[PDB]
Structure formats: structure tokens, C-alpha cells
Amino acid sequence: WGYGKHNGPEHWHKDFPIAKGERQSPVDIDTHTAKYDPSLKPLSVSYDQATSLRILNNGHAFNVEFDDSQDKAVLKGGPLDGTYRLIQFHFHWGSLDGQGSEHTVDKKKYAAELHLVHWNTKYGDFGKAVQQPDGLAVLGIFLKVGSAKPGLQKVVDVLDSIKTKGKSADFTNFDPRGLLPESLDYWTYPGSLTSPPLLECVTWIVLKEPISVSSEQVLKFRKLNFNGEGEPEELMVDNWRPAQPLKNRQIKASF
Ligand SMILES: [Hg+2]
Ligand SMILES: [Zn+2]
DSSP: OOSSTTTSGGGHHHHOGGGGOSSOSOOEEOTTTSEEOTTOOOEEEEOTTOOEEEEEEOSSOEEEEEOOSSSSSEEEETTOOSOEEEEEEEEEEOSSTTOOOSSEETTBOOSEEEEEEEEETTSSSHHHHTTSTTSEEEEEEEEEESSOOGGGHHHHHHGGGGOSTTOEEEOOSOOGGGGOOSOOOEEEEEEOOSSTTOOSOEEEEEESSOEEEOHHHHHHHTTOBSSOTTSOOOBOOOOOOOOOOOTTOOOEEOO
């Protein structure tokens, strides 16, 4: 699987039948049909103690991994029950500024989308979490092209070193707090991972307010390669999946 014409999203169903499931992600967020739920609590992001470890190019994207052996960086509150530990963050981006995000707002697409993945720590490890309907929580953040995002530059600068598939680099002392918008208002719905295995284990929490990044910052994302070293060069662009059918699910809003 990849994002090209021969192994693209439209083909994932063949190897991952769940591709056509009942709670697939991403979806279109219709702001007028979204339900304000007053019973929804404020999100609690505790990332002061986050321990970034490394950055790796896995052939589909670049992942920043965190030490999740203790409740170091956690997410709680909102629509969630119990604690969820940050394990990794990654982005989805387009070849042009008019596309890149997974989720859309009133059919509007952003230049990129940041996903902060967390797993429910009553399941003990990530692998068990993926076997539960409430095993995972992803914080989704939209990226729009405008002014540079200072807290994003350390990531941009190490990309050169993980240009092709399978490369990794030490990446410690990176604070994820530097990627958050001012406002924590969000939308939430039950979905799934947006790339195979597409497991339907996720509680989505898509933030209303996008963060802005510079054109030059998004340009370096686009210098990455899907391919391994010594292979014909295929630029890592458009690694996003098209919106899926809501199918009776209800999207709730905290505002
Ligand atoms: Hg699941
Ligand atoms: Zn993702």
C-alpha cells in the first residue's frame, strides 16, 4: 500500500477489508450538522514532561517517537475516559497548499494535518489498545500556510537526515507544546486510523483552530522520499486519504 494510482486509497480494501467499515476516517466535518454537546469537558493536555526519542521516515511519513513507558505526556478530559499516552506524532501534507489534510471543514481542505497519537493506558501497551474500540485517541491539528511556526523549525531542520525510507535520527528534547493552537475547542467522533491497518479504535479530537506555518516550512516536507535509498526517487507528497462516509455517526462539538 501507498498513495499512488496502483496502490492508493482506492485499493486498500483488497488487503484491508475494513477499508469499507462503519467507522472509517477521515470524514467531512459539517459545522452546521455538528451537535454542540454541553456535557463535553475541556481537554487536558499534559505534555510538560514529554521525552522525544527519535525521528524516522517509514516510507509513508515521518514519525516523531516519544518514550511512553510512563505517564509522561498524556491526554485526558474531553470525550475521553481515563488516560492516554502520547506515543508519536506525524503529518499528512499535499503537493500544493490547497490539499493535504485528511479531515475537511465544510469541505475545506488545509495544507496539512498533524496527528498526535495516544493509547489508553488501561490496556497496558499500544498493541493491546489497537484491539479495543476506545483504545486510541488522536489529536488532529490543521496547518494553513501563513507565518512561520517557530516551534516547528527543529523538525524541519532534521528532515535532510531522514530523506529516504528507513532512515532515522536521534531527536530528543523536542517539546510538542510548540505545535498547539491557542484554543482547545474541538469536534469529536468515533473513527479509525487513516492508513492501513485502518483499525476502528479511534476517538478523534479535531481542533477547530489551525496553526499557521510558512511556505518554506511546508516546502521541506515535500523534499522527502517515499522510496528507499538507491531507488528511483518518488517525492513524499499527498500521503492523505479522502473523506469517508459518516454513516450515521454523529459529530459533536465542544463549542
Ligand atoms: Hg479497535
Ligand atoms: Zn495520521
